[PDB]
Design a protein around this ligand. Structure first.
Ligand SMILES: C#Cc1cc(/C=C2\SC(=S)NC2=O)ccc1OC
Length: 343
């Protein structure tokens, strides 16, 4: 059995060969990414005389249609004049090659997960996470443009990449799972660790879910570990409840999946269901961040920009991004006016 005249494997993925030359232009070096969508290769563009990342979408109608949505979103974002658009991965061009849709992006550096791994999961300076926080807040403000109204829908350290390994400039990549504001067509969305309470409770979701994701990411970038590392959605909700407490009754009364996690007592109030965790809201973020104990594991004791005053500004902003209420959860514009960013 051969697939696509021997160009494709059995999983519809194009068989990447180091040194192969496409259309007398792109020279493939190596595979730099993989997923259900297909693969990503480092290639040299002979025309522009620069390195590019080519996202080879696997030869399947389902995966091609998903990529077409991604291309439309990227091209729509590219059209906007604002210089906030330079916090989003730039799609240079897209073409069909041997029955594969190929998205040519600008070549970037390491993602923030590789960064966390370089630290052995002890996290980066509060000064660096502030630089990341402000760029991310600007990127989410850009996606918040009414004409775009884009929900990234899969924000995580892996999907945030450095432009340059010796600069702190970041770009959000992978809009392959993205939607624009609209009917709640999907419900199992976002990576588990960065999944908003809305999605967990199966309630309608807006652009605020990306802000929840950001809150979870920035704490992780400082401490080194995911704030909420759930083995399942029930474990996920319980780990959120440990830090933030029981979500307000007004939210859970409207929540279709409320009773997956909580039981409604005869007095109208909500408790957890038992099956292991701290009492609700007793794993204070004050302690996780180490506000008064020299930061995470006391590893930032005596470091410049790691004062109690600096940590309190950070904690205030993170608690505003992790507001259970998506309608009062802090929006990108207001997050950018926060004292955490005031020099
Ligand atoms: C490694 C890498 C890598 C990935 C991208 C972009 C992607 S990957 C994806 S899936 N969706 C995108 O938009 C862009 C540049 C890169 O070079 C480090």
């Amino acid at each position: 059995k051969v697939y696509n005249d021997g160009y494709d494997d059995d999983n519809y993925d194009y068989i990447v060969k180091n040194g192969e030359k496409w259309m007398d232009r792109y020279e493939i070096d190596s595979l730099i990414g993989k997923g259900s969508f297909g693969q990503v290769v480092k290639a040299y563009d002979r025309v522009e005389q620069e390195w590019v990342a080519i996202k080879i979408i696997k030869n399947k109608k389902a995966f091609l249609n998903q990529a077409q949505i991604e291309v439309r979103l990227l091209e729509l974002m590219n059209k906007h004049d604002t210089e906030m658009k330079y916090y989003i991965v730039h799609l240079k061009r897209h073409f069909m090659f041997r029955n594969h849709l190929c998205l040519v992006f600008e070549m970037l550096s390491y993602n923030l997960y590789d960064l966390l791994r370089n630290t052995n999961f002890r996290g980066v300076s509060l000064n660096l996470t502030r630089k990341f926080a402000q760029q991310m807040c600007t990127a989410l403000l850009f996606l918040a443009t009414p004409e775009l109204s884009i929900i990234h829908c899969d924000l995580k350290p892996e999907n945030i990449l450095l432009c340059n390994p010796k600069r702190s400039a970041i770009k959000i990549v992978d809009f392959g799972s993205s939607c624009q504001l609209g009917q709640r067509i999907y419900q199992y969305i976002q990576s588990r660790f960065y999944r908003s309470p809305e999605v967990l409770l199966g309630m309608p979701y807006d652009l605020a879910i990306d802000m929840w994701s950001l809150g979870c990411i920035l704490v992780e970038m400082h401490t080194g570990e995911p704030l909420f590392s759930g083995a399942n959605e029930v474990d996920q909700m319980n780990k959120i409840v440990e830090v933030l407490g029981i979500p307000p009754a007004h939210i859970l009364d409207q929540a279709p999946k409320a009773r997956k996690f909580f039981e409604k007592l005869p007095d109208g109030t909500w408790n957890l269901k038992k099956t292991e965790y701290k009492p609700p809201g007793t794993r204070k973020l004050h302690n996780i961040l180490g506000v008064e104990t020299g930061g995470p594991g006391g590893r930032r004791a005596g470091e410049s920009g790691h004062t109690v005053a600096d940590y309190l500004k950070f904690k205030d902003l993170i608690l505003r991004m992790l507001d259970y209420d998506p309608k009062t959860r802090i929006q990108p514009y207001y997050a950018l006016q926060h004292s955490f960013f005031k020099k």
